[PDB]
């Protein structure tokens, strides 16, 4: 019945020195039954990334919705949408369904192409926006992530370092959660390039 606990999954993004990183687990199941070992939850429209945890059907639906919305935007405005802006789009798009929400917990991460400052944010299922300087966590293992992050985190880490951190944060938080895990993916984000690495992790 709790829409937010049927499929399972987690997402977390942090900010480093001229970088951000966002990672997620690959699981998709139906309660106890693990069904898919290949379900990614991080998406990107241009250089803006959005990870979504929650009811898989809604995760998929909102991605589709944001692709559409981002695409049109690009045609009218003639430039790729920015993180600060996308965040507002997500927020409003969520609040639009205030009394029959999408059971999700989105996370936005990216680097403003103009100013270059790293940016990340998270939202509740109805649009409350939480813009933070350190990290954003979401999913069934939110508590665990909040635990790993709060401790493991420290300001201005370089890309190569942030990777380890975000990874250990995700990895260990997942292992204390039944509904998450089954593989993980991390995105290291820099102005110029973005790297995607898959992690070896307990497959239980």
């Amino acid at each position: 019945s709790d829409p937010s606990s049927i499929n399972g999954g987690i997402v977390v993004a942090m900010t480093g020195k001229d970088c951000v990183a966002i990672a997620c687990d690959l699981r998709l199941g139906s309660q106890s039954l693990g069904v898919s070992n290949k379900f990614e939850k991080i998406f990107h429209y241009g250089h803006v990334f959005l990870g979504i945890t929650g009811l898989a059907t809604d995760v998929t639906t909102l991605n589709e919705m944001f692709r559409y919305k981002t695409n049109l935007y690009k045609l009218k405005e003639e430039r790729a949408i920015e993180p600060e802006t996308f965040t507002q789009l997500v927020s409003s798009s969520l609040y639009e369904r205030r009394f029959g929400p999408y059971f999700v917990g989105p996370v936005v991460a990216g680097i403003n192409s103009k100013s270059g400052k790293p940016f990340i944010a998270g939202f509740d299922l109805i649009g409350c926006i939480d813009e933070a300087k350190d990290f954003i966590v979401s999913g069934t293992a939110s508590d665990q992530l909040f635990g790993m992050c709060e401790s493991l985190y420290e300001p201005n880490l370089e890309p190569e370092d942030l990777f380890e951190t975000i990874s250990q944060a995700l990895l260990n938080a997942a292992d204390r959660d039944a509904l998450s895990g089954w593989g993980a993916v991390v995105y290291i984000i820099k102005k110029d390039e973005v790297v995607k690495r898959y992690l070896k992790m307990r497959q239980d």
Partner: protein, 244 residues
């Protein structure tokens, strides 16, 4: 009564012709000429601008060539405003098809949809049609490079090279004269320019009076690149061809 002031925009003449469509097609023939040429590795859209001046800003201008989606574009001939309306709706249908099937929309599907909206204004409603005609240049997995055209009646057809707006007959003849099935983009460009050159109702074909676009499927990539020529680039290609 109210009827008293109704023009009956959707009626047939005693000859079985739709007045307003006919009269809109007329409006269109007074509009700048747009040309689309379909190659074996690209498609070219070129357009001649109407309403110019020393003061008009051509840099940040795009009054004839619009991007419908990453793989499709249109050249317009007619009321620039009437056009935008259709274009905005065409842009959405592209995205709707994407959301629904998770595949880019097939050029003809986009086209047919637009044309059906036009036909509507033709058969019911009591409103004036749109004084617009498009040439669509797009690419897709099923047919590849495609060039089509639609007009106020809502009829559409496909071409290897075509033109719309003023001096169609002239440009068409010229097109039928030098176009050949196994052409090349860089060549189609020239032809397009040439054609505009011999139909222009102005002195010389200067960059500031043109809009140019090509849809190329570069060999070293795979994705269909849509490039809307920037003023400087128009001037350049205009020089290469020789009009100067």
């Amino acid at each position: 009564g109210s009827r008293r002031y109704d023009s009956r925009t959707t009626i047939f003449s005693p000859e079985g012709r739709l007045y307003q469509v006919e009269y809109a097609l007329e409006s269109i023939s007074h509009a700048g000429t747009a040309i689309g040429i379909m190659a074996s590795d690209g498609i070219v859209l070129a357009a001649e601008r109407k309403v110019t001046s020393t003061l008009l800003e051509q840099d940040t201008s795009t009054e004839k060539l619009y991007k419908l989606n990453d793989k499709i574009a249109v050249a317009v001939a007619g009321l620039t405003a009437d056009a935008e309306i259709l274009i905005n709706t065409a842009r959405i249908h592209a995205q709707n098809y994407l959301k629904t099937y998770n595949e880019d929309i097939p050029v003809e599907i986009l086209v047919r949809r637009l044309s059906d909206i036009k036909q509507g204004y033709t058969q019911h409603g009591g409103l004036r049609p749109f004084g617009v005609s498009f040439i669509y240049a797009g690419y897709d997995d099923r047919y590849g490079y495609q060039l089509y055209t639609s007009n106020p009646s809502g009829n559409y057809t496909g071409w290897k090279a075509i033109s719309v707006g003023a001096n169609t007959s002239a440009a068409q003849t010229l097109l039928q004269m030098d176009y050949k099935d196994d052409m090349k983009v860089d060549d189609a460009i020239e032809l397009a320019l040439k054609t505009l050159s011999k139909t222009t109702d102005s002195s010389a074909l200067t960059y500031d009076r043109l809009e140019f676009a090509t849809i190329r499927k570069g060999a070293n990539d795979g994705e269909v690149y849509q490039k809307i020529f920037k003023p400087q680039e128009i001037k350049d290609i205009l020089v290469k061809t020789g009009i100067t």
